[PDB]
Amino acid sequence: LPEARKLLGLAYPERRRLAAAVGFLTMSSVISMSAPFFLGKIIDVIYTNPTVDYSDNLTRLCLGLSAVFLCGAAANAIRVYLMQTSGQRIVNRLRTSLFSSILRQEVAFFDKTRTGELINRLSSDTALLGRSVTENLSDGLRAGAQASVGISMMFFVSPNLATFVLSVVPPVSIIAVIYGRYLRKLTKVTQDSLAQATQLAEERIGNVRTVRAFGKEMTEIEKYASKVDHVMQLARKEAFARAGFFGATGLSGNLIVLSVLYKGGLLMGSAHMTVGELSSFLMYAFWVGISIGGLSSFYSELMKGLGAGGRLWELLEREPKLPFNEGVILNEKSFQGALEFKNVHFAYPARPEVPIFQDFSLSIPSGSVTALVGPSGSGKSTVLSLLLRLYDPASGTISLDGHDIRQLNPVWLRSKIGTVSQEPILFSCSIAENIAYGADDPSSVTAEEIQRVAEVANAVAFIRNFPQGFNTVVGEKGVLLSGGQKQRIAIARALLKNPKILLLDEATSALDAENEYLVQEALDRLMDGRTVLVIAHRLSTIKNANMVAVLDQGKITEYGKHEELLSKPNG
Amino acid sequence: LPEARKLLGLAYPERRRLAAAVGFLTMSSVISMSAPFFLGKIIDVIYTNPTVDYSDNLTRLCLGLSAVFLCGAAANAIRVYLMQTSGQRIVNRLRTSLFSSILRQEVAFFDKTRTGELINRLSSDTALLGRSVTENLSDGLRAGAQASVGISMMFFVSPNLATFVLSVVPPVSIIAVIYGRYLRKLTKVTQDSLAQATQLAEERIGNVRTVRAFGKEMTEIEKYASKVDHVMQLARKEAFARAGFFGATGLSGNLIVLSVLYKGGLLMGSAHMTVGELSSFLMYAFWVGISIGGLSSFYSELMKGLGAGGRLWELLEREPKLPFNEGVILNEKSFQGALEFKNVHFAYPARPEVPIFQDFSLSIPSGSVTALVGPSGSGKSTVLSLLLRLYDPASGTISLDGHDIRQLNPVWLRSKIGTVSQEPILFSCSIAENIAYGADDPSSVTAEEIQRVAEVANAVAFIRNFPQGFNTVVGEKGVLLSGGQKQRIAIARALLKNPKILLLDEATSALDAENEYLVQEALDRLMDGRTVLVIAHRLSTIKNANMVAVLDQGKITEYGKHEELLSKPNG
């Protein structure tokens, strides 16, 4: 019931197009159901009057039927168009609405939901739902109307023959459903066995180095051969049941038709029916058969659409656990760029058992370079995720110029913070579009502005050296870039953003010699006159930093100047 | 032509089952094609003699038809079984033969071929090929025979009406193929546009952290909305062409049938034909129509099967670039376990541009522990891949007791070498089956032997602590184990193998305190009385090693004792 109201509201903006096409469907289906009745009358006319010339009647009827078909073709053409376009408009609304809900969700949601599932819900499930209220609804409506008129016309033509069909088909159908359920079981048994054998195959192929190492290729080959030779034994049993079922289905189908031809034939000779009347009944019986299969198919697709519906309403009505674009903004005067971690406790949502910060307190003063030092896996990169408010701490507070970052507008907060990652991420756009991404309006930035920041970032040389220049499509689906090239485009993107706070994640595994000089020069121009928090692995950056913070087991164990920290009581 | 001989040879072991079922198919199809001809004669009998009682004739004919259907059902049941089983036996041979060819290939082949493609070729393409010589062949044979008899019976019943159908259908069909080709183009245009929009969606969802960082969620939402709103415009144009095509197809189909009813109707009145004769012709015309669609479908599946055939014969006939189980074996007397790298040059096949070893010479003496020292990414793990002969060097030689490992049987060579990896690999088997994997005959090892090696490896405690004990299914698809637990089962597997040469890859990122003691004790028992080559990151192992080798830029830069290396001219 609550799912039905959601499906009705989905079709509601297209109600006039769908009703017009339903009108065309109703007409086409009803006028078409007249053909067995009128063909029954024409059959009896020829039979009664074999001596009469019907040339003018045939020509007048065929010219009449030609115009009816031309109208029928135009009606069907208009109907298909209205149904396809209505579905397209429904799917379009579902695509834009779903993608909007997804991007508004917190990072933690993406941590527990695979991109593949979100894309499957965006591609497959939106297509299902769209046609389920349109094309599927028309299919089930046509089949439902044709079964109704068909059964009614069977009882109209002959109540005796119709009651007979009604007493024979249901018992046969119930027995066929029991045989069909047994056949489904034997198929699962064969396909479970086959799945096991393919998992074995996939595991051994994927880990062929370990298989070689232990000289087990011949062993695995024979292990797999035994599994698939067993699948063959299960498939033989499934084939025997399927053969016996197709034989039983075929026999029953033929003997039911034969019973109607026989009973009908007897009723003809008894003067209860005519040859044409029997032809009507058989034609209507064939139509009901097709209409039953049509309703059956409609039901399968209705279920698939309802299943897809639940998966979409689940994301569309999902409220993010972190504010999207809501909170305060600070004026030019009260914003200085000072940050403060105060007794911060945090564990990732995917691994809540593993604590990252255990009473983490750090003061990053305005315009000062703070160097974050610690062992690999200590949780240095987690500091950047918390400052951008990708996640909220479990306990403690993160403050910007005395304000808890939870009170600020997150979109605004992130506009004041720039980041240059260990492994920069570039989308499959032009180099210019990737650089423009820094700006609050990437459409407003001029070609001259993209060139300026590219020169400062020591990127302008390799970019112009590319055949397409700034229009070179990069990312995964485009032209591949070196680590240092990606980093300089990231520095260009940061430069254009022009943040007061800058967060730097240095590479522990240092890049090439020629890159490492051009990148260090660009990083220094980017660090100038900004609040910098650097996760450093180079002794040159720690020495030049205003203060050094040592992260050991989720807490700041040591805090002071590089010289003061090195000149510890034990040295 | 060469593909046709391969398809014939594939069906050859099943030739007697397939020929028997073809015999049953031929009978069923031919006896069935008699029904429109005999129904035409019965129609004319009723018409000519309306005053005659046909009760006994009807009852005798229906009882006769009942027995013919019972034979027809039994023939169809036997045919389906023989076709399903024949295909199953063909697919089974294809599965075992393909998996055997895959596991026999060199590691470099797996480096350039994705497991997904190999599994798709093992699952999908084997199923296609199997039914293409069976079920598809029966389908195309039936359709081909029924179109032949159908067209022959159309010309037999009426050469005038058949010539008429033959002059009308081909021109209409050619125009429909041109419209169908145009419709395919408009569909690709819409689906190329939709693909672009989904790639954008997937990229942005997958990289939502970067999108948040630059506050571009609202920007991307509107970028995607614009792309899918454009897809809607292309889909509207595709729907207009599809509507006009379904209308044209429907009209033509109806007007062709109407032409035959009209021309036939006129020929009836002229005394050139009877009502029954026309019914025969129309029934045969409907059968040819279905048979044309049948041949068309058979052709699509023949092409799919030929495509899959080429992909399978490609791997089945592939000769590995490295010997599988061919070469010499050394006697107890001449095998001591001494290894020697001599001027080894090697670059991985996937990255040939990047050299790993540049004149690499190393002597690992019998019963001596050699510690391999070098920077991360220097190519220390590549030494283990070359010793197991997973790859062959480009230049230089690897020798075992003076013998080039290329002359030895690789399966035998690997039986004398054991490895304990940084990240051990366990299959989705029981713990016992994973341990038994060490033995040359994992079926021959007793429960007592698996328990012995488990005690030495300090693994017996946690294994027995598991609810299923040694029968606990581990790996990816089973119960998850800690790094130290996996390593101790790897040490148990190595212990059972009992190799003379042992290759150890220590973890640079050291595991937990409780594990690191139980693992170091088990590693020491495993190192005892063996030729050991350890890639060390712990100062305790380098100090206790007989000699240390420093790997710097694919060459052994320094070679000597830990004390001698530390007491270098500059220290």
Ligand SMILES: CCCCCCCCCCCCO[C@@H]1O[C@H](CO)[C@@H](O[C@H]2O[C@H](CO)[C@@H](O)[C@H](O)[C@H]2O)[C@H](O)[C@H]1O
């Ligand atoms: C696939 C599963 C198997 C299918 C089931 C097969 C069951 C057998 C079907 C037999 C059909 C013949 O059924 C037979 O029809 C005639 C004609 O209506 C009936 O005959 C009776 O009614 C008719 C009127 O309807 C009278 O003219 C006639 O005098 C009277 O005897 C028989 O009482 C009935 O037995």
Ligand SMILES: CCCCCCCCCCCCO[C@@H]1O[C@H](CO)[C@@H](O[C@H]2O[C@H](CO)[C@@H](O)[C@H](O)[C@H]2O)[C@H](O)[C@H]1O
């Ligand atoms: C397996 C094959 C099955 C084939 C179908 C069954 C055939 C059975 C043969 C017996 C039927 C012949 O039975 C006979 O049919 C004609 C035509 O309908 C009936 O005739 C009735 O309709 C015709 C019009 O069609 C009128 O001209 C006639 O005045 C009227 O009585 C006869 O009254 C009836 O006795």
Ligand SMILES: CCCCCCCCCCCCO[C@@H]1O[C@H](CO)[C@@H](O[C@H]2O[C@H](CO)[C@@H](O)[C@H](O)[C@H]2O)[C@H](O)[C@H]1O
């Ligand atoms: C979907 C695309 C459109 C479909 C194409 C439609 C084309 C029009 C079809 C018209 C059919 C009638 O075709 C007409 O048949 C009769 C009967 O055979 C022919 O009539 C001729 O031959 C018959 C014998 O065959 C003689 O009895 C008759 O005296 C003679 O005139 C006409 O010469 C022919 O014109």
Ligand SMILES: CCCCCCCCCCCCO[C@@H]1O[C@H](CO)[C@@H](O[C@H]2O[C@H](CO)[C@@H](O)[C@H](O)[C@H]2O)[C@H](O)[C@H]1O
């Ligand atoms: C859109 C609807 C189309 C419906 C199909 C076309 C109907 C056309 C109506 C005109 C046909 C009537 O034409 C008439 O048919 C009968 C029956 O075949 C023929 O009769 C012929 O066969 C019957 C047997 O069936 C014999 O009893 C008879 O001796 C013989 O001449 C007539 O010689 C012919 O003139």
Ligand SMILES: Nc1ncnc2c1ncn2[C@@H]1O[C@H](COP(=O)(O)OP(=O)(O)CP(=O)(O)O)[C@@H](O)[C@H]1O
């Ligand atoms: N999305 C996520 N879900 C769960 N755990 C995550 C995670 N992202 C990171 N982690 C884990 O959090 C821990 C600390 O993360 P982080 O990446 O911050 O540290 P680090 O930057 O100190 C590693 P390195 O020094 O090698 O770059 C790691 O053990 C990491 O695997």
Ligand SMILES: Nc1ncnc2c1ncn2[C@@H]1O[C@H](COP(=O)(O)OP(=O)(O)CP(=O)(O)O)[C@@H](O)[C@H]1O
């Ligand atoms: N199958 C493969 N194809 C291509 N390159 C590969 C490869 N396996 C390894 N490499 C590359 O070869 C180089 C050296 O490999 P290897 O794994 O031997 O070194 P290492 O063991 O010194 C790394 P670490 O010290 O971090 O464990 C690396 O740059 C690695 O990425």
Ligand SMILES: [Mg+2]
């Ligand atoms: Mg990091």
Ligand SMILES: [Mg+2]
């Ligand atoms: Mg390694």
